[PDB]
Design a protein around this nucleic acid. Structure first.
Length: 69
RNA sequence: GGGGCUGUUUACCAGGUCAGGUCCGAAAGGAAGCAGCCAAGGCAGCUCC
């Protein structure tokens, strides 16, 4: 379960935008997304870093709930 | 080394375009710009000077 999937699933538009600012690698293997990338991603989807963090936080919880069935 | 070809590779770090998103504006409209793609660079093979 990667960011490509979590994407399938008005505030959800802002979520898309954030994922649409990543690279194929960043989605497939999110854990490689540290400071520098976050910055690029935020500024890229007209967002702020915390919004990216929030998202990533969400995907995590979301993935977590997956690694439990 | 330079030209051409082909394969591969490259988040952001003054190329271009820029979906999505953002910014400014009452609006009409402007602005910056990630991914992508194009280009460009890297690692190589062929080839020409």
């Amino acid at each position: 379960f990667d960011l490509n999937d979590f994407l399938e699933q008005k505030v959800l538009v802002r979520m898309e935008a954030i994922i649409n600012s990543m690279t194929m690698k960043e989605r497939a293997k999110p854990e490689i997304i540290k400071g520098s990338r976050k910055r690029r991603i935020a500024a890229g989807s007209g967002m702020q870093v915390q919004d990216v963090n929030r998202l990533l936080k969400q995907f995590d919880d979301m993935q977590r709930m997956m690694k439990k069935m």
